[PDB]
Amino acid sequence: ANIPFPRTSGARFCGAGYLVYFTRPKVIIQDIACLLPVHKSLGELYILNVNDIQETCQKNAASALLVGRKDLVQVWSLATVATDLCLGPKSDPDLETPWARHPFGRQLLESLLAHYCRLRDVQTLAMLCSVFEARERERDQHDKNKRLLDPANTQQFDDFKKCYGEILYRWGLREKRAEVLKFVSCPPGVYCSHCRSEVRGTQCAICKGFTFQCAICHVAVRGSSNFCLTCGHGGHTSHMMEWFRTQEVCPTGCGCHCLLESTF
Amino acid sequence: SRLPPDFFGVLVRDMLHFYAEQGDVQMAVSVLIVLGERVRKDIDEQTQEHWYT
Amino acid sequence: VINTVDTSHEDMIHDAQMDYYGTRLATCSSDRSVKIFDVRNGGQILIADLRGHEGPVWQVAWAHPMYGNILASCSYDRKVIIWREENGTWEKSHEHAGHDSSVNSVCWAPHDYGLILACGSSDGAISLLTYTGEGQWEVKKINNAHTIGCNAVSWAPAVVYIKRFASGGCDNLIKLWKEEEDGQWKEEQKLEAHSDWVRDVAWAPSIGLPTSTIASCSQDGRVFIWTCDDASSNTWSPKLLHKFNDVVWHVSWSITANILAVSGGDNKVTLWKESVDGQWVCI
Numbered sequence: 087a088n089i090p091f092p093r094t095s096g097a098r099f100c101g102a103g104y105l106v107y108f109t110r111p112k113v114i115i116q117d118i119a120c121l122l123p124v125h126k127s128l129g130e131l132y133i134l135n136v137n138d139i140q141e142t143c144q145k146n147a148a149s150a151l152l153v154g155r156k157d158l159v160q161v162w163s164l165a166t167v168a169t170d171l172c173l174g175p176k177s178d179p180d181l182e183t184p185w186a187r188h189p190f191g192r193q194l195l196e197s198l199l200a201h202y203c204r205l206r207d208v209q210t211l212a213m214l215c216s217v218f219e220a221r222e223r224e225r226d227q228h229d230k231n232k233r234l235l236d237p238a239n240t241q242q243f244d245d246f247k248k249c250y251g252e253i254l255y256r257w258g259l260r261e262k263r264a265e266v267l268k269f270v271s272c273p274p275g276v277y278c279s280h281c282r283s284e285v286r287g288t289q290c291a292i293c294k295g296f297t298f299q300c301a302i303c304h305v306a307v308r309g310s311s312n313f314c315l316t317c318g319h320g321g322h323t324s325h326m327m328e329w330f331r332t333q334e335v336c337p338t339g340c341g342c343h344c345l346l347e348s349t350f
Numbered sequence: 351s352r353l354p355p356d357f358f359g360v361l362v363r364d365m366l367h368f369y370a371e372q373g374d375v376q377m378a379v380s381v382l383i384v385l386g387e388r389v390r391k392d393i394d395e396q397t398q399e400h401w402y403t
Numbered sequence: 404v405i406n407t408v409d410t411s412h413e414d415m416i417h418d419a420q421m422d423y424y425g426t427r428l429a430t431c432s433s434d435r436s437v438k439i440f441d442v443r444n445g446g447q448i449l450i451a452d453l454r455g456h457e458g459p460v461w462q463v464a465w466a467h468p469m470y471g472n473i474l475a476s477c478s479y480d481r482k483v484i485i486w487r488e489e490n491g492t493w494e495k496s497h498e499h500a501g502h503d504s505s506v507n508s509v510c511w512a513p514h515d516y517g518l519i520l521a522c523g524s525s526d527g528a529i530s531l532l533t534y535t536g537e538g539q540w541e542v543k544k545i546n547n548a549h550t551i552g553c554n555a556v557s558w559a560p561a562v563v564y565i566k567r568f569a570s571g572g573c574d575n576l577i578k579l580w581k582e583e584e585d586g587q588w589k590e591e592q593k594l595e596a597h598s599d600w601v602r603d604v605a606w607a608p609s610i611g612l613p614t615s616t617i618a619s620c621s622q623d624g625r626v627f628i629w630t631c632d633d634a635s636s637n638t639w640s641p642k643l644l645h646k647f648n649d650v651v652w653h654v655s656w657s658i659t660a661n662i663l664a665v666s667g668g669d670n671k672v673t674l675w676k677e678s679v680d681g682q683w684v685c686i
């Protein structure tokens with residue numbers, strides 16, 4: 087008629103390192119992970135600091151050694167030597183030539199990036215773009231010139247990080263996804279005790295006072311907290327963590343088993 | 351595997367020319383003498399003579 | 404490795420797909436049933452034996468975990484039926500049967516847009532179901548899609564929005580679509596290099612390279628790779644990879660779009676990889 091003929095054999099890529107297929111005579115799951123540029127172990131062992139980069143580079147070089155990435159130990163050592171604080175740019179354009187104009191800066195970064203783009207390795211691209219982020223018409227051109235990443239290609243550098251974050255979410259590591267996504271350039275009613283008003287914040291606007299008061303501690307809460315939806319009593323998070331570890335009543339003698347109301 | 355045989359063979363030449371254009375032939379000549387034979391057959395014969403002289 | 408699983412079904416198996424994490428496995432069959440297993444550490448455990456869908460099921464498609472546990476399942480009975488997992492139990496949630504003929508393909512949209520499911524039936528139309536909130540679904544149809552009927556659909560990766568998918572059908576022409584500012588799903592282009600019948604189409608994931616890649620499969624047997632890297636010229640150049648001796652059924656990409664797996668009527672599964680010279684070799 088018009089319906090096509092039934093399918094009886096197929097194969098799909100599922101997960102981040104798996105293959106699912108079935109054939110005419112059962113379905114089996116084969117771990118096709120030695121066929122992909124990315125690596126699961128490196129994702130678990132890669133650290134990414136923002137204060138000490140000189141330690142990040144060496145820590146990742148050791149991790150790359152532990153797995154057998156000979157080509158990557160070179161790259162990480164080169165990044166280590168090319169990112170010292172000794173090569174900091176100066177504000178005046180006439181004082182010195184920047185390190186970016188040197189052939190061992192931007193021109194070598196773009197010589198590694200194109201090679202890895204051809205090899206199609208998101209992991210290294212995303213980790214490299216994160217590490218290397220740190221009259222008057224002239225001063226503007228100088229500011230554009232003293233950077234190791236071209237300011238006219240920010241989009242690509244961001245989508246690299248985005249795709250790697252999605253991969254890390256697939257694998258199952260949620261802290262290391264936030265750490266990576268932290269480098270993306272673009273961005274993503276508590277009652278008061280003095281006037282009984284709905285104030286949105288840690289400080290009131292009528293009496294200009296603290297609105298939230300710890301229900302164990304009675305020191306004003308300005309940071310993180312949690313509370314029950316119905317009773318509306320809560321305070322510092324560790325305080326309730328200790329309290330509710332062994333009891334099941336509202337600490338202010340309210341009568342609610344907040345464990346059954348706060349947690350859905 | 352590894353990085354390709356000569357992946358940086360086109361950057362040391364640019365570094366040498368970069369240093370020689372500013373008038374700093376000391377660095378270029380010293381690097382040429384130290385390296386010896388890995389950068390030798392890349393620079394034209396009439397440029398090494400100029401830099402040495 | 405291997406994780407052998409016995410289906411314990413009574414008829415043939417038409418589709419099989421795993422979850423977004425590597426922990427569950429859904430199976431369609433020809434017994435009007437959809438069995439959800441739990442493939443962890445080799446376990447062939449059972450969690451559900453969902454029934455209904457009078458005809459034989461043909462395809463399944465899991466949703467993004469950020470929206471919870473959902474599963475779309477089309478079949479011959481011209482009905483798409485959608486599942487959830489409430490309080491640790493799988494149940495029928497909503498059915499939609501706005502198609503005269505059998506619905507052949509289902510494909511979820513990228514999660515950045517939201518929760519949109521595209522279903523193309525054999526009556527030459529595409530039905531898009533949008534989750535409007537509070538358990539409400541909005542349906543917008545595209546009548547007179549293909550001369551005979553659509554067979555497979557695919558969604559393009561989201562870039563910085565312009566929603567855009569790609570459908571193929573029994574008219575031997577691959578079509579592209581785009582949603583206008585008002586909401587009109589205006590046609591943009593059409594590609595014609597096949598001969599017999601296109602069965603499955605697949606659009607490559609993006610990792611930032613300015614290049615869009617679409618695979619295709621024909622009934623006579625030809626996998627054509629439609630590269631296009633002209634930025635905003637909207638020009639596509641077909642290529643070829645082989646000419647088989649059967650009906651090519653399905654093609655699937657990898658997460659980094661470097662390996663293609665093609666399965667057809669030859670009762671075999673082949674893998675492929677692009678070489679440095681620009682030719683596609685097996686492995």
Ligand SMILES: [Zn+2]
Pocket residue numbers: 278279280281282283290291292293294295
């Ligand atoms: Zn107040």
Ligand SMILES: [Zn+2]
Pocket residue numbers: 300301302303304305321322325
């Ligand atoms: Zn306290």
Ligand SMILES: [Zn+2]
Pocket residue numbers: 317318319336337338339340341342
């Ligand atoms: Zn209370």
Ligand SMILES: [Zn+2]
Pocket residue numbers: 314315316317318336342343344345347348
């Ligand atoms: Zn309570």
